[PDB]
Design a protein around this ligand. Structure first.
Ligand SMILES: Nc1ncnc2c1ncn2[C@@H]1O[C@H](CSCC[C@H](N)C(=O)O)[C@@H](O)[C@H]1O
Ligand SMILES: Nc1ncnc2c1ncn2[C@@H]1O[C@H](CSCC[C@H](N)C(=O)O)[C@@H](O)[C@H]1O
Ligand SMILES: Nc1ncnc2c1ncn2[C@@H]1O[C@H](CSCC[C@H](N)C(=O)O)[C@@H](O)[C@H]1O
Ligand SMILES: Nc1ncnc2c1ncn2[C@@H]1O[C@H](CSCC[C@H](N)C(=O)O)[C@@H](O)[C@H]1O
Ligand SMILES: Nc1ncnc2c1ncn2[C@@H]1O[C@H](CSCC[C@H](N)C(=O)O)[C@@H](O)[C@H]1O
Ligand SMILES: Nc1ncnc2c1ncn2[C@@H]1O[C@H](CSCC[C@H](N)C(=O)O)[C@@H](O)[C@H]1O
Ligand SMILES: [Cl-]
Ligand SMILES: [Cl-]
Ligand SMILES: [Cl-]
Ligand SMILES: [Cl-]
Ligand SMILES: [Cl-]
Ligand SMILES: [Cl-]
Lengths: 291, 291, 291, 291, 291, 291
């Protein structure tokens, strides 16, 4: 019945993740552990945030997201555990996921547990929350935690207790909003009639280029499907294509497609060929779009 | 009880596969999702085929194979769902898998669902099929599918409905045989008394070299275990060894072994050393064998 | 209820692991298969040992560890199956895992099954064993095993029978202690007042450097937290820092931390930066430590 | 007084070039040997052509160009020695080289000696010739030439005899025009109003991109300095800039400059930054230019 | 008789340097052109400066140094031509070069010609100068210079006229000191009793590490040969060795040597092994030394 | 008239070689300095030897070879200066170099000067010598030599004095034969009727493979041009071809050629393609040949 969806910076080249899973099954025998991914750049909370923010609408209600990169491991820091508000629609269009008209998710139906280091910034921003607690109770964490392995001690373990029905409000004291650490998200800037952002990610394993320019930013400027766009990357690359729903709309294999990715963001690719890999395009390069 | 075995080109560097799994558990609460792999070269249907064709005899009857690389995502194309006929023996010798005499599998016991883009070419060729349907019903796919994520929309989602016991014949109309896209498989050619093929794969993580020269191709030349072979790769690097059951039969560590791999194909390796990696041997290089 | 924790050298780039899993579910329908890792350097039994030795205390009692690199596959060799004695405490300090005071594990609670090639060397050394058997019974292995895939035939399959409650003592004859293959572990030497060992692993994905110098080796040399250490790597590159519990104790980002890792061994890192990657530090480099 | 300007595919990692030089000084004691370069891709006659075609106007009259890549070494092939007609103006503008108004060179003032394999194709095309001879006389080549080192035997040695005043007409028989091997040069095509060519070279060590679109091809298309151009590379990567004389005209460091190189061809660069290296741009990529 | 020593950023993979040499021989037939090197990082004036500052004492009086990296090519900028004052002693000890007691060089005996872009900063600092002129006369430069090739037009050509005895004072107007562009050289800082500098260069092809901490800096602190030093690179590498004259003084092959290089600067190496290459040490890393 | 041929481990990435040249022109104004190469692996005397042993027959009588890799720089070691006996024929066939019947060189006509560290081992072995002296006289070396630059101090400088006619016997005391350091050359072994040696070099820039199996080794096995050979590299990659004079005799581009290189040694290549580079073949790999 209960699900823990687990996202960490632990990698998959040793037994580290398996140690966390052993403890999850120990504490909540009937649990199903779903790997989110374990491949994020260590300590890059903005990147980790990207792998967890879009999750809730896909999962059954009552799912617990155990999400961690813990560079402050072994310090007096304690994890935060939050019940989110809106499961939140998503995608290029903003919809429920699933067959038919999709699976509508109730509010207050998902818990995230993470270091209190900004990792949940965009989860809180995009979903809101109903309650948040500091994770301190020796009922849900070790009395003597391993200094270097707080993702296990302070996330995996308590997540399993939560999955098992340990009451959220009993993990430790309520946290005020200002006590929840946030990172600052770079805003999309208007520059004349151009929108100015960045490449937010290279979409592996395809080598598509994702930007932080959202559907809603495009709406502000009236850019809908069909608009001929100039999208300039790294300052010197004035790509030109219409905004289309998908890759194949570019026609011939190799042709430039400018589209909305499954996360709702303006993106650029080649049709059934890699854009980013041959030219070594990178996250953090500038991205400007104009009609 | 139900199992979905999931093979995609999504990778494991973000939450993409986790989103599919979330929907799979949502639709079919009792399901077990088994990762086949998510590492294939995007949009290489021939390679994808290799990862799925050998699967049925290993899995419990009733298993659904959700298999996808979807470069035509967001177009009017629709997936194909097929009930295969013969589970099919396999391996170096052609046998059932498992302990004792192996686990014999009843016919008609497995469903594959895939883009209709040739991905199932070798599944159909080696297993046959009993029935095939176009996947169109809004009961099993989204009414408004995400343009760029058809592996989720048109494979993961309906696969979970099938695992959940949604009648196969209700997914959409029956497809005639000519409506199922196939790729052309390069044939092994006889060239005097040499068999001429190709390196089909580098067997990672070992760096063994796999060819498309099947056991049946060797029997047809009368080549059995013990035959001294000259196996020439890339037209220029030749090798000489007896055909042996396994690596250790080569003797000293590092010695050349020519063998039949666990999928029934002529292969070449060094004994407990890598052959491919030091010499940068690659898929697609010619492979010629002669007694 | 039953759990198989699976560690192999099979990788995750083809369907090899999924084939084993299919058979595991076939044999033991209610089993949960947990991936330990599949990324070990092929045939490196010392490295594989490291990924399995610390597992038992994390898992529910009754867990079966299926652990394999099988370079002698297809030969007359047979696997060994052992019931270990002590679950064994671990970590920087030596404790039970889990919330509160941790979860104590009963003796005799875990089975390992592996090639008899030394892979279990440190498992047996650190946990002891109560019983050990050669795996030969056609009830738990194939009568005609695939020559190249003994990890599946002789580890995965029988592990699933064991998980299903097949009596351990029925897998084949008892093995005497001398019949269980061991590798020799390089000892830490005292050299004057310095301890001399090796880099045992680069801790991915962080680039931390792990040595084979154990807490107890430090204890014997009169070294505890707070001791200023000089640690020399590769007989060239020197570092100096106090022994501290964790990374952040080093102060500024990028500063050297010398610490005890979660496995109980002397290690060195940069605080929230990679030590090993910029300097290309490697497994097998010498490591010398002095107060 | 006498000069040999030496261009080979011999490299500079062994004594090969020094062996040729030793013989040059032996034969013509007062000679000055000038290295052109020795780094060309072996056997690439088109690339070797580029390193020699622009030389004559820079050198004193009477200079001998010894130019060689000799993949047909050790065969019945013999070198060609030609006296060119026009020294030929060059550069972005088409002028004589040197201080003041430049140094005009008399017609018939330079000899090239090379394998008869097409290496001199553009030399003959851009300079014309007055006379051409097969190099066969044992007075200027070895009676027993080294099979693998014809660049030394059939170019370096005879070039030194020529520099020493050995009569050109005495090296062997006159060659007719059809007996002089030519490669085919890919033409620049007009495609609507766009010029379509290729990247002819990456200009090391800067990473500037050179095309085969000549000043005169631009002239015919109505394009002069100041014209805003769109230049597309590899059919994917677009750049836009005015045609300017030099790099600094682009303004800020890193800005795109589109210009005429010192050989007279349309080129593109970043101002005091590398264009080609970060994007891995390559020789042979398509290059399309439009006003 | 006359010598031009030529240092540029032109590389040795095309005919660019040979074009400059052709013109040098054209203008000054009896000249000897000596390659300094052509491998510097383009536009890195600090690096170019390093390859030219130590030259004068090695060369016959009357030598002309033609030294160029010209990113401002094709602009209104003009080269500077300077007669230096002190030829200047050098080396670990500060001496004349040559056999016996060395070759004492007269003052005012060397000319450098370069872009006026800071390239001569350390030449002027270490040698002083007696006169400096802007290079503008059409007698020594082209009336219509190639826009992209000012190293040839504005350095190679005029250098050859100077070698031929064209009067220095006739190249153009005298320049005031403030009109000669300088870069700022990073000072060695005292930090307690440590000297703090940088790695100024990796010494290829050996991989020795050179710092900007000079013999004279070492004298200020009393550090002479025999002093046990701690030299910390990149902030975290506290190397320890005595200051010794040479590599072999470190004893065993591979041992750390801290020494004075042939340019007079504090350096660190391994004895007959590479220090920098295995650990990827780099120019610009911090370098701290203390007794 | 005088020539110095200069082979060092100094590289061409800084002004090091230029400093030596400056001193050479200072000491011997009329000299011509010919670069042999400066690219050898530092401190690899065996490799250095390869670049110098074949030189004499190519150069005018009276030529001085200044040859250095000086890992013992700054120690009490002193260079050796030798007058060699036989200039020595060479090549695939063993002949004089040059046009016509070649240039016969008188005995005693060449001097080498080198560190006394084995660098001249093969020079002495293949040419013999008439006289050898330790280089100690302050007339030909510095009274206070630079500790780290002995190739300049103890080779370049005295070589220029010798070129200038300083009497060889006046450089210091005569050395007895046992005082001249030699390295041990690995012998070609006979192994049944196979000849067993080593890959001595990858022939750059082509990627041909050179062995230490000499023509004389082949004659001793009766192997002449036309013999079908099996040549096995690295113990595992074998090749089959007739021994032919040159590359083109292999026929089609890419075909394997086995030949005698221009230095008289058994070699293997592809015809106008690289053999070594795609397969990463390396110096030091075993090389076995059999008829
Ligand atoms: N160098 C470093 N500096 C700061 N935090 C680090 C670190 N290396 C790892 N961490 C943190 O420590 C945790 C993993 S250490 C635990 C896993 C490890 N493979 C083991 O077996 O012990 C993660 O939360 C990670 O972000
Ligand atoms: N450039 C491209 N051209 C054609 N198909 C592409 C493509 N890039 C991805 N795809 C297809 O689109 C699907 C993945 S898009 C979904 C995964 C992505 N990481 C995300 O989060 O949105 C796969 O079926 C893939 O084969
Ligand atoms: N070159 C080699 N020498 C010795 N053993 C090898 C080997 N390559 C693989 N093996 C062993 O054979 C087993 C894996 S072969 C089975 C997996 C393979 N990808 C397949 O589908 O056939 C492993 O136990 C491995 O260690
Ligand atoms: N693999 C190959 N196929 C065809 N020609 C080749 C070749 N390798 C080298 N050559 C040709 O042979 C000549 C050089 S071989 C002479 C130089 C060599 N380093 C030596 O010392 O022997 C060149 O003209 C080159 O183009
Ligand atoms: N991208 C760039 N931006 C600014 N200056 C550049 C540049 N590329 C080269 N240069 C400058 O231009 C000069 C070389 S261009 C001349 C050589 C070139 N290989 C040719 O044949 O035309 C040098 O002075 C160099 O520093
Ligand atoms: N780490 C090291 N150990 C032993 N010898 C070394 C060495 N590094 C350089 N050498 C030797 O020292 C000489 C070069 S030092 C002189 C060149 C240097 N680029 C400079 O400008 O000072 C060569 O003889 C070389 O072989
Ligand atoms: Cl963690
Ligand atoms: Cl998909
Ligand atoms: Cl296996
Ligand atoms: Cl040649
Ligand atoms: Cl220039
Ligand atoms: Cl030297």
């Amino acid at each position: 019945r209960p699900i823990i969806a687990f996202m960490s910076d632990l990698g998959t080249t040793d037994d580290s993740v398996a140690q966390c899973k052993g403890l999850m099954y120990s504490i909540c025998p009937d649990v199903t552990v779903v790997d989110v991914c374990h491949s994020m750049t260590p300590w890059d909370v903005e990147e980790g945030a990207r792998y967890i923010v879009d999750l809730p609408r896909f999962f059954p209600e009552g799912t617990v997201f155990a999400t961690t990169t813990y560079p402050a491991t072994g310090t007096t820091t304690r994890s935060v555990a939050v019940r989110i508000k809106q499961a939140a629609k998503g995608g290029a269009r903003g919809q429920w996921a699933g067959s038919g008209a999709g699976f509508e998710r109730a509010e207050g139906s998902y818990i995230y547990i993470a270091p209190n280091n900004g990792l949940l910034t965009t989860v809180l921003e995009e979903h809101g929350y109903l309650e948040a607690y500091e994770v301190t109770s020796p009922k849900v964490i070790p009395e003597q935690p391993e200094p270097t392995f707080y993702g296990r001690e302070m996330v995996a373990i308590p997540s399993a207790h939560l999955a098992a029905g340990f009451p959220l409000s009993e993990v430790g004291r309520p946290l005020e909003d200002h006590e929840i650490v946030r990172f600052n998200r770079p805003a999309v800037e208007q520059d004349g009639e151009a929108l100015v952002g960045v490449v937010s990610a290279i979409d592996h394993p395809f080598g598509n280029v994702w930007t932080n320019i959202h559907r809603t930013d495009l709406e502000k400027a009236g850019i809908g499907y069909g608009a001929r766009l100039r999208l300039t990357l790294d300052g010197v690359l004035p790509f030109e294509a219409p905004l289309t729903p998908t890759f194949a709309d570019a026609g011939e294999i190799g042709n430039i497609a400018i589209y909305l990715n499954s996360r709702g963001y303006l993106s650029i690719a080649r049709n059934a060929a890699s854009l980013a890999y041959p030219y070594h395009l990178k996250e953090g390069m500038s991205a400007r779009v104009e009609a």
